[PDB]
Design a protein around this motif. Structure first.
Motif, PDB file in Angstrom:
ATOM      1  N   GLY D 117     -11.871   3.656   2.331  1.00 27.92           N
ATOM      2  CA  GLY D 117     -11.599   4.682   3.594  1.00 27.92           C
ATOM      3  C   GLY D 117     -12.112   6.061   3.048  1.00 27.92           C
ATOM      4  O   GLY D 117     -12.911   6.346   2.321  1.00 27.92           O
ATOM      5  N   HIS D 132      -1.354   6.643   3.482  1.00 29.91           N
ATOM      6  CA  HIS D 132      -1.685   5.687   4.444  1.00 29.91           C
ATOM      7  C   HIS D 132      -2.411   4.565   3.713  1.00 29.91           C
ATOM      8  O   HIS D 132      -2.037   3.250   4.297  1.00 29.91           O
ATOM      9  CB  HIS D 132      -2.277   6.275   5.534  1.00 29.91           C
ATOM     10  N   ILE D 133      -3.566   4.752   3.000  1.00 29.92           N
ATOM     11  CA  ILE D 133      -4.355   3.885   2.599  1.00 29.92           C
ATOM     12  C   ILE D 133      -3.588   2.958   1.653  1.00 29.92           C
ATOM     13  O   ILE D 133      -3.919   1.630   1.472  1.00 29.92           O
ATOM     14  CB  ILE D 133      -5.776   4.136   2.382  1.00 29.92           C
ATOM     15  N   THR D 136      -1.171   0.443   3.692  1.00 32.88           N
ATOM     16  CA  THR D 136      -2.346  -0.661   4.012  1.00 32.88           C
ATOM     17  C   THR D 136      -2.398  -1.496   2.840  1.00 32.88           C
ATOM     18  O   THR D 136      -2.404  -2.612   3.124  1.00 32.88           O
ATOM     19  CB  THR D 136      -3.321   0.049   4.819  1.00 32.88           C
ATOM     20  N   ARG D 137      -2.819  -1.088   1.685  1.00 30.64           N
ATOM     21  CA  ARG D 137      -3.257  -1.961   0.487  1.00 30.64           C
ATOM     22  C   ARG D 137      -1.980  -2.862   0.082  1.00 30.64           C
ATOM     23  O   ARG D 137      -2.186  -3.864  -0.011  1.00 30.64           O
ATOM     24  CB  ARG D 137      -3.685  -1.398  -0.538  1.00 30.64           C
TER      25      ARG D 137
ATOM     26  N   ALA I 123      -9.323   2.850  -2.109  1.00 29.39           N
ATOM     27  CA  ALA I 123      -7.895   3.305  -2.085  1.00 29.39           C
ATOM     28  C   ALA I 123      -7.547   3.780  -3.242  1.00 29.39           C
ATOM     29  O   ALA I 123      -7.018   5.085  -3.181  1.00 29.39           O
ATOM     30  CB  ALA I 123      -7.038   2.075  -1.766  1.00 29.39           C
TER      31      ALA I 123
END
Lengths: 6, 183, 182, 182, 182, 182, 184, 181, 182, 181, 182, 183, 6, 6, 6, 6, 6, 6
Positions: D117, D132-133, D136-137, I123
């Motif tokens: 991202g 956020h990322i 997500t991971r 990430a």
């Protein structure tokens, strides 16, 4: 920058 | 404009008269050629007096960097290194390359270490050659950095796997510099 | 315009179990070819399929989607090279049913090593290099099985672009016959 | 041109037999189509298996989760078959098929890695994007742990960089159940 | 887009069962289509539920309000189901579904934030644009307060920056009524 | 654009019930379509109402006047409904609906402002262009005065800069007759 | 999208009632279509009126003359109705309708002006291009004189620069016969 | 638009065994022409096919896909040059059934050596050069067989762009007859 | 740039009287020049004041810290005078002048805000970049707290968004010591 | 080329003349400020002459110049030649009272500040408040320098407002129209 | 390269009170010419200055900076047109001291109305139009005074590009003499 | 900016001591400058050594041969010192220094490979271009054989692809005489 | 939108 | 997605 | 791809 | 292409 | 800017 | 420009 550099 | 001081010198030339070299940009072949020439000139003028290399650089070409590195180690005078602002990548390698006991950073200066970057496009065999080359380059950098810092090769490898930002004080603890220059 | 018969011409050929691979191999082309092979097998699991190849090659993974589908289905897939079969195109030519791989007399076949790219950290370049070298080993192994040539010979002969006549492709074991005219 | 069979385009003809082709990058448009196909097939018959063929380099994580959540929600089992390549969110969807019914063809490639991202702006904005990322991971890794039987710690290590698997290795890892042999 | 067989594209086939798919950015074209679909469905049957599936990063606020006002105007209940992501105006529409009939799938993401825009020219022109977007924000916040049960003050604070919610958090917030479990 | 089943695109299906959708910028193409639709509907039935739904940022003044003059010319009443936004020439057309039958949805935006243009060349050419756009503005203001009941002087002042109105304010102004409440 | 009525697209449905829509810039493609429509309609019925609706900023003079000459050639009367705008070659075609059957809607704009063009190269080439566009202007002015009743001298003066007319002014000028007023 | 007859016009011609090669020769065009030839042979293995050529040429391998298909199938393929047959276009004109190669009177035929390119290492350039020289030998040999001219003469006459009238193309052996009205 | 007459460009003539002009964006080139000027002036005279005139929208934080650290390192006092604008790293340098010798002219603007940056990739890479810019912000805020007498908590709040101060407000805040009146 | 006698501008600076002949940006402001400071240091009592032909530019750059003019001891005369627009007309009005001039055909233009804002509603609000405060500051000072009310300056700068030299004098932007002997 | 004499060639000419206007008139050129005129007056308030003009014109305001400076200073300024004096260039030619305006025999003089442009709101276009019309009135009035031609004739003769020979320029009153060779 | 010493730019100051810096790509401009410098130095003193410092990724073969032929023509010995990198025509010039007086610093990289070029047009034109670059490669390989002591056959094999050498490997190969180690 | 439009 | 939507 | 998928 | 394909 | 800077 | 500036 002395001392010591110069 | 770069200001003039008054013999009429641009400010950098005036500093060079006092054995100060400014590495204030990306490292490419042109910059390396200039710095190498300055180092050789200063040694010829006086083989015993210290040189001061001020470093504010995001890094750049590894081979250009090694032109500077090998010139520093070759000449008789001690080259003091002072990080102002930032020494990243090959910039931090040159910072660590200064005479032992005479590597400095100013207190808010940033030092960043990481693995070398590059690129290859074409046949599998060509990609293989490029990969082998950059991996050998990394081994060479890591070995020298081990010698200059006192850290093991294994630790250097792990600590440069990704971008690793250090404060001046952390760079000192790491062995990349000898002292934080406090006001 | 693609002409119509009373079907567009390619759809009319598909009705007689002919698949035309007449372009670069990418994911779209592979998806279409795979779908066509599956459709034809479902219609009739015993009758031969004919894959006409005029292609400069393309994506290796897209190529392997087609390759694996050919080997999976029950019908024999005949391959016929018209014009040119290069790179992954020549790999698919060689993938046809043994005894049923053909080239027209002036068709060109070219074999070479896979192409790619890598950018970033040394470690990233290493991963990409290892990947494309493994891909090449996989291609060479299968091409060895399909042609009867050793892996070592395939490696040497694909180091650079290697252009073959139809007759040379037959001698190499990439095809079984040069299709001569009545 | 996509060929026609008799009047269906080839993909529509496959959809009649409950086959969905995911043969491209995963974006919102592709996910909307796949989700719609899954819902349509469940409405037609809530008991019969669906077959999702995957040849995809991955793409949007949120688009991928639209597909993932729809697969888990609907009553029919969704079989997954990797042809060519299943990378990134593509390999996540491959692993998401009904247990016992996840396949790869023998020369298919599976690749796993961490999400990618971007973040631009004020420090606080970059912090929000990073958090956020990273969440997500964690979510991806947790689900992949559940679907493979591997620990979260091992998934984390094995996806740190691009990790290419053969079909056989993907089976050993728990991403698929079987290599589909000819 | 696949066809099913009357010959329908997949989206048209879903619309026959009162399902509308919002799977993109919200612009005037998309809003015009969705509004038209809602009006058509109400005319067909003023009592039966409509289902609006949302996977959207948001977009035009005025386009969004065309959809919002149409939902509130028509007699049928409009269920909202978030798959993948509902961000910005997308999350506003998710919250706009009939009370008790707003859903998210378990891995779906909901994001709320303040409106975005731009102005160039004279001080007075910038003033007009600023006043307009601040009024737009007040209007969004007021409605979101009514739809969630959260105070206007809390909505203001929680949308100051990008705020990413899990499905479960969106339920706790009052943006949806239920997480749709498999 | 979805299809409904006779097989109609959704807009064509609405046109069957005398609904015209103005859901874009106003240019010559859009005006030609709308004019043609109005003439067709009058020919089908000269007595039944027509419904013009407006979500438009405006556009060409001359294109707008093609629509305006056609509305006033035909025998049927044309109802106007603003959804989302009616700006500039869009708000002019909203106001052009049959008296008593101009509506806006509650969160719709209406914007009025002076016409925009440009001129390059000799002083004399710039003079001609300036006189032309000032005459165009006088014509718009006069008609808007007749349609709203506001004075020409007030319209001039209120359109000097971009002036954004709520639906309720548009009703108070005389641009619409009613806010269409749920 | 162009809507469908029932299967005709809306323009094709209008063509069935002898209505032709000129709703764009005039180029060779547009002229070829309009000419074809005029010929088709004459072949269907050589006596019934045709209706040409004009909303056009103009365009190619030669394309415009393809339409003009076809209008004058065919047996049916061609009525012209300006909606929105008829500028340049658009206003020329408006004026070309059957006498007594040229209309504009009340808020329609009509603009007349001299032809535009371009020339690059040797002095001799520029001379040829200049002579050509001046002859083109004389031809347009002469025909416009015949169609409006205005003198050539007055047309020349009134088209020297962009000249914007209301529908009512276009009627006074002789470009149209009537302003089409609403019954209401 | 391509006009319709009640078929698009080209499809209507294909019904009477006429194939139109009216563009640059690339893989797409070759695939279409090859498919048309195969279809026509399957419909009737004995009746003549007519290939109309107005083409500046293009890909040599695409051209050979067409060439080899013409020689392979049972029906005679007549060739008719209208407008221009250049480069691989003139090669295909010459490839028609002997006695049934035609050009219209004002048609242009052009012959020349193949064009290409190469970038990279000396060894890569060598491989590319050898390939295009072999391609030229192959074209020249076949053109020698189809025209009756020697290989040496073809080599000399294609060294640069060589424009022929229909009548000159007949004298050369590229066509059999000029089609007079 | 005008010349004065020894021939000096005007900036070089000011440097002779120990005046440094920072009249641009702060990048590495500008910082290298300013640092060099400061070192030169200290070597010339270790006791006399230096005057740093600041009209700058800011720029690179690391370039800014090169200047900052050089100011604190050298023996002479560095007076700072804001003319026009000192924003971002420009306002940081203004505050860095010798205590009692920080000035702004009466109509000068001072702006403070949080640092800006960017991050793209995996990430883990985004996490590293986020942690780095958050540490950078803490460092800036701490020093600004020391130089102004405001608490770290107040600095954090007051730099969350762009915060424009008059000269008088900058004095009240502790960013400067005096407004320089005529 | 700029001619040499000193380059011509440097020769004028020797007689205490500063030429503002361009858009006002940070570079131009830095130069003008430096020139003003230099001239004050040379002689704190003798007048300076600022010639203005400028379409304006950056408001903050303009204020660097403005505040420097008011700060230094010498009177700064302003002379508008050609055009003084926007921040250029603000600087014209900033000259020592009684010593602001325009040549007879010079144009003076006043208008409100221009800018931009992009992003979140809150960010646009901050940018709007900032440019409105900037305009209040400009209007206040222009009120003090001209004798016109703040309300009148606000109304007269709503759109581009072009003045003749004579109108600029009547407005209070200058003291005299400089007529020729 | 501009040659040197022992001065660059233009500086050497300036020593003999010759100014060369050999380009488009913009602010930079005007500033230089004005500075040269002021310098020459300061050196000697009684001796003639010679302004050589080869210029297609340019900025009207830049032109008026030069014009007003010519009329203000004590020395007579002779004007000599070589090559071309067009637009504002021909205005400056006419502005020379009466009796001392010259053109070389093959020089071209062109007069026409001012050029400009305007984009935006009707009101903005009006302001721009009024401004350029006032500018034209000002130019025409002065040209009337300098030539002896009526304002009405100047207006008519500048409506379009009007090219004059040197001899025609003399007859018109733009110059006093054609400078013929000995 | 290139600094000044006192009035010489740094490179001009080095040229006074018979040092030439080749710190860029080799093109016609660079070759013309280097050739001119070599001729100037020979004219000043036909007996004293010249020092050519090389940090270059290579470039034009013909430009390279202008330098090469000038080195061999003039009376003074030209020492070569590789700093950073000498690749392609850069490594050819490194090998062209006076025998016994070719050096590399310890971390310098040397790369050898076959010449690169391009050809577009008719078959016959491509043939001419191919023959030309193959002849050029034979010429380079022959001279490199003479300068290194390696066979032509070995040079051909070792330059087929990019071949990266350490300083020590370059010495073993015969491209340089000594690795210049630091005191 | 009925009633009443349609 | 039924039950219950549809 | 059957058996077994279909 | 028959015989033999088809 | 003196007094006091310089 | 004098009198009076200079």
């Amino acid at each position: 920058f002395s001392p010591x550099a110069p | 404009l770069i200001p003039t001081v008054i013999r009429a010198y641009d400010i950098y030339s005036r500093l060079l008269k006092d054995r100060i070299i400014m590495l204030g940009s990306q490292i490419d072949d042109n910059v390396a050629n200039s710095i190498v020439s300055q180092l050789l000139f200063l040694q010829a003028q006086d083989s015993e007096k210290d040189i001061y290399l001020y470093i504010n650089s995001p890094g750049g070409s590894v081979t250009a960097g090694f032109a500077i590195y090998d010139t520093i180690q070759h000449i008789k005078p001690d080259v003091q290194t002072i990080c102002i602002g930032m020494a990243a990548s090959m910039g931090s390698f040159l910072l660590a390359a200064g005479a032992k006991g005479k590597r400095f950073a100013l207190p808010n200066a940033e030092v960043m270490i990481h693995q070398p970057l590059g690129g290859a496009q074409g046949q599998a065999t060509e990609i293989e050659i490029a990969a082998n080359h950059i991996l050998k380059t990394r081994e060479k950098l890591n070995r020298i950095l081990s010698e200059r810092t006192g850290q093991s090769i294994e630790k250097i490898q792990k600590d440069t796997d990704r971008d690793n930002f250090l404060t001046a004080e952390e760079a000192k603890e790491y062995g990349l510099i000898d002292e934080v220059m406090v006001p």
